[PDB]
Amino acid sequence: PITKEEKQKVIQEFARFPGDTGSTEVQVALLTLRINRLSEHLKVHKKDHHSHRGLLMMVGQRRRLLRYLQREDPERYRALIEKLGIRG
Amino acid sequence: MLTDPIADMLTRIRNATRVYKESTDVPASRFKEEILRILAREGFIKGYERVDVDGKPYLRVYLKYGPRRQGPDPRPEQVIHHIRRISKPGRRVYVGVKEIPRVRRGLGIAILSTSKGVLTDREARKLGVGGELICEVW
Amino acid sequence: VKELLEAGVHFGHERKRWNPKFARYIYAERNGIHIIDLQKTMEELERTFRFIEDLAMRGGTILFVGTKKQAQDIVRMEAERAGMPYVNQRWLGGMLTNFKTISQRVHRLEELEALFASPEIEERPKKEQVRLKHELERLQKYLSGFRLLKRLPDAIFVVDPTKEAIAVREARKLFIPVIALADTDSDPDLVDYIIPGNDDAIRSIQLILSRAVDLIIQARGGVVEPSPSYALVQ
Amino acid sequence: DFEEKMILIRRTARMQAGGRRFRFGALVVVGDRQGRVGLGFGKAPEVPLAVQKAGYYARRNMVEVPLQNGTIPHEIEVEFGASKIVLKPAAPGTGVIAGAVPRAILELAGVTDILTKELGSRNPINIAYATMEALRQLRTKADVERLRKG
RNA sequence: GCCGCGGUAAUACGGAGGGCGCGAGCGUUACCCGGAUUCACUGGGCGUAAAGGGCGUGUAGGCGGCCUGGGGCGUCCCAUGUG
RNA sequence: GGGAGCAAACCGGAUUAGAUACCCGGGUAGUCCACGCCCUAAACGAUGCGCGCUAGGUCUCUGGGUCUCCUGGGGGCCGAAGCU
Numbered sequence: 001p002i003t004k005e006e007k008q009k010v011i012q013e014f015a016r017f018p019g020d021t022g023s024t025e026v027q028v029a030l031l032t033l034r035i036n037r038l039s040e041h042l043k044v045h046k047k048d049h050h051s052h053r054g055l056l057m058m059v060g061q062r063r064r065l066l067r068y069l070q071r072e073d074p075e076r077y078r079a080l081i082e083k084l085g086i087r088g
Numbered sequence: 089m090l091t092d093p094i095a096d097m098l099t100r101i102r103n104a105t106r107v108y109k110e111s112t113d114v115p116a117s118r119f120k121e122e123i124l125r126i127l128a129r130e131g132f133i134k135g136y137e138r139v140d141v142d143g144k145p146y147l148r149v150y151l152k153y154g155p156r157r158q159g160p161d162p163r164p165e166q167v168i169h170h171i172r173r174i175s176k177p178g179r180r181v182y183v184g185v186k187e188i189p190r191v192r193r194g195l196g197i198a199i200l201s202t203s204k205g206v207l208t209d210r211e212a213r214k215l216g217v218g219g220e221l222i223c224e225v226w
Numbered sequence: 227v228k229e230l231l232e233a234g235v236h237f238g239h240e241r242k243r244w245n246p247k248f249a250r251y252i253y254a255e256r257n258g259i260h261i262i263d264l265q266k267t268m269e270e271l272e273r274t275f276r277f278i279e280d281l282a283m284r285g286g287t288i289l290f291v292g293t294k295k296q297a298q299d300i301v302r303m304e305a306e307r308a309g310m311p312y313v314n315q316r317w318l319g320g321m322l323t324n325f326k327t328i329s330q331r332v333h334r335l336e337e338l339e340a341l342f343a344s345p346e347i348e349e350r351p352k353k354e355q356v357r358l359k360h361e362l363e364r365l366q367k368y369l370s371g372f373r374l375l376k377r378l379p380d381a382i383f384v385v386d387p388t389k390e391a392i393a394v395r396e397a398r399k400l401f402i403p404v405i406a407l408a409d410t411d412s413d414p415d416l417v418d419y420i421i422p423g424n425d426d427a428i429r430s431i432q433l434i435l436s437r438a439v440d441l442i443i444q445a446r447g448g449v450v451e452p453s454p455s456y457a458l459v460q
Numbered sequence: 461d462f463e464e465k466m467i468l469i470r471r472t473a474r475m476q477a478g479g480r481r482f483r484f485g486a487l488v489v490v491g492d493r494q495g496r497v498g499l500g501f502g503k504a505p506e507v508p509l510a511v512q513k514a515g516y517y518a519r520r521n522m523v524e525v526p527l528q529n530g531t532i533p534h535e536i537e538v539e540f541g542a543s544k545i546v547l548k549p550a551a552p553g554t555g556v557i558a559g560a561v562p563r564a565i566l567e568l569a570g571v572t573d574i575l576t577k578e579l580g581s582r583n584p585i586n587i588a589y590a591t592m593e594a595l596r597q598l599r600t601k602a603d604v605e606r607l608r609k610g
Numbered sequence: 611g612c613c614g615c616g617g618u619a620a621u622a623c624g625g626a627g628g629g630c631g632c633g634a635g636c637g638u639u640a641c642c643c644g645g646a647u648u649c650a651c652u653g654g655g656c657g658u659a660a661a662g663g664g665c666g667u668g669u670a671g672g673c674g675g676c677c678u679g680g681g682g683c684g685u686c687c688c689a690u691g692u693g
Numbered sequence: 694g695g696g697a698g699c700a701a702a703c704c705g706g707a708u709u710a711g712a713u714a715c716c717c718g719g720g721u722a723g724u725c726c727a728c729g730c731c732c733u734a735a736a737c738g739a740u741g742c743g744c745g746c747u748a749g750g751u752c753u754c755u756g757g758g759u760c761u762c763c764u765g766g767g768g769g770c771c772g773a774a775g776c777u
Contacts, residue, residue: 053666053667056666056667056668057666057667059667059668060667060668063668089674089675089743089744089745090674090675090744090745091673091674091743091744091745092673092674093675093676093745095745096744096745096746099745099746099747100745100746100747102746103746103747103774103775104746104747106747106774106775107747107748107773107774107775109747112746115675115676116676117675117676118676118677130608131605131608131609131610132608134610145676152608152610154607158401159398159399159401160395160398160399160416162398162415162416162418163415163774165607167607167608177673177674178672178673179651180684180685182684182685182686183685183686184686184687185686185687192534192535192599193533193534193535193549194534194601195533195534195599195601195604201685202685202686203685203686203687204686204687215687216687217686217687218685218686218687219685219686220685220686242750243750244749244750245748245749245773246748246749246773247748247773249748257761258761541777544647579647579653580647
């Protein structure tokens with residue numbers, strides 16, 4: 001899966017400030033990481049549907065967040081979405 | 089997640105009562121206490137008071153019931169045999185001054201929110217106003 | 227005098243097979259059993275006897291009942307030793323509620339009680355000599371304490387209510403003050419004068435039933451010593 | 461002894477070898493006309509017997525109808541099983557506007573003016589017991605605040 | 611009119627005596643509202659009576675916790691025009 | 694592509710008045726796999742989802758604790774009030 005070690009790298013990379021174990025920026029960055037991972041997966045196990053479902057959720061959840069973000073603040077929205085390179 | 093907190097308060101009350109309980113704790117809400125104050129200022133409950141369930145501020149609401157009864161089902165009659173919200177979030181209910189309800193041929197009440205405070209089927213009428221027909225008790 | 231007696235060995239009963247209603251009368255759960263709060267017990271005893279007394283002094287009859295073995299006998303005593311009707315055997319259905327009709331048997335009792343001593347015994351075949359004689363054995367077997375007054379009670383005292391809740395019911399439909407010694411395996415609500423306390427250990431039963439009859443008599447004149455309580459009392 | 465007018469009488473039936481056996485149900489109302497009405501449903505092998513029992517059972521079951529000026533104290537809706545019923549007090553000299561049942565009962569109730577309506581199942585028996593619980597649930601400005609003393 | 615009636619004793623058909631109703635009218639057919647809380651805002655429902663979508667994800671839309679302040683569109687009051 | 698067993702259809706044998714069946718002996722597609730369609734059902738708890746409120750008892754799967762007990766999640770039974 002994802003090493004605690006790698007998972008952190010992400011977190012430490014998006015934390016709006018030292019510490020910051022949660023938050024939008026993060027929750028998103030994280031979901032993403034999981035998504036692609038899971039993506040690449042199913043891109044191999046088309047037959048693995050149940051897991052597909054999980055993607056969607058992960059997928060929507062991210063939608064949600066960004067939406068809040070975009071709403072609350074556009075600035076760091078463009079920022080995040082940009083750095084993660086999303087919304088295609 | 090509670091859509092209409094008020095309708096809840098009533099229900100919490102409408103349930104605690106149906107079983108004969110000392111007091112019930114409805115979650116803190118200025119506007120809620122109003123329906124409470126009025127609820128008591130009209131003699132439907134012993135009264136109430138603020139509390140806190142671990143940083144969680146609620147409102148103890150003491151229920152008033154009747155005298156024990158003679159015969160089967162010696163269950164004491166209740167002060168509130170009926171409370172039901174009117175204006176719901178799914179359908180706001182507004183009334184003009186001439187439209188205010190006449191709860192239980194006068195024996196009843198009809199709390200409601202007005203531009204100038206929270207009044208009842210008489211009070212508001214006396215003030216000659218109108219507003220969101222919050223509900224009705226009796 | 228009171229406390230000590232009770233505190234002696236006459237409180238705390240049924241365990242884990244209770245009724246939440248009766249949660250107002252109970253101190254704690256020691257090693258399993260529910261330890262009823264005597265402190266409160268007392269308070270209730272009061273109002274109860276108050277009533278009893280406020281009735282025992284106005285020419286009112288009471289009906290006691292206890293159809294459980296671990297409390298039969300005694301109830302038989304305390305009743306005769308007070309002239310207060312009672313039920314020790316099978317509490318027939320519709321007694322209070324169908325008195326007029328149950329009475330019909332009481333009358334049938336004497337109907338025989340009289341034919342018992344008579345010259346008509348010279349005749350009559352063995353068929354009936356056995357029929358009647360037997361028909362009386364049982365007849366007399368159930369009404370031994372349900373005769374006295376040919377008028378409904380002004381109240382009724384009882385051991386385990388729920389055990390005889392049926393009587394209770396009858397009582398309640400006919401509007402009749404209900405008083406009784408109930409433990410944790412019963413619901414108060416439908417009990418007017420509640421004597422909270424053990425309903426099986428004859429120890430508590432005797433006591434609470436004893437001081438009850440005395441009190442029934444204190445309002446009549448003739449204060450004496452207790453009644454035959456011990457004979458095999460543990 | 462009061463007015464004693466019977467709502468309805470019927471002939472039920474049961475099955476058994478050789479044939480069906482009958483019985484009769486009589487529903488009766490008994491009111492003085494001052495605020496006391498009783499509702500007794502009597503069943504027995506024969507019309508008369510039924511009737512009577514209804515009366516007896518009735519008297520044994522009555523209720524204090526808190527009249528007022530000749531009408532009810534306030535409006536009331538009472539659902540009893542399939543049946544439902546509305547009761548609205550009308551100004552004096554109005555009439556007792558209700559169906560056979562609520563009437564027969566309300567007439568002896570003592571009311572002279574009351575607006576009504578049977579809702580849901582119109583079954584006699586049930587509307588009958590329905591009407592009762594209706595009355596049996598009425599209130600006066602007195603016994604109203606009599607409760608909200610405090 | 612709905613329920614139903616007539617198979618050789620029909621209060622249901624046809625005549626008669628009688629009776630009830632309304633009356634210069636009385637009936638019939640047609641159509642609208644009612645009763646019908648039987649499209650249900652007032653005022654209904656879906657476990658077995660007709661009625662939960664095979665399940666999920668989610669767009670629009672509908673609905674929304676607690677506290678303080680600004681605006682005042684909804685809402686409410688007064689006056690006036692109008693009707 | 695694969696094919697042992699079973700098995701609509703099919704053929705025999707019986708049963709029966711008949712037996713296009715139930716029972717018996719055989720038997721193909723299918724049932725299997727890959728990839729792609731079809732998208733139905735007594736697709737049932739015949740009970741939409743989310744949240745709040747309203748006695749307990751019992752046994753059971755699983756998590757935590759200063760572990761005869763307390764507390765969290767799920768599945769069953771019996772049942773307060775109340776509903777029908």
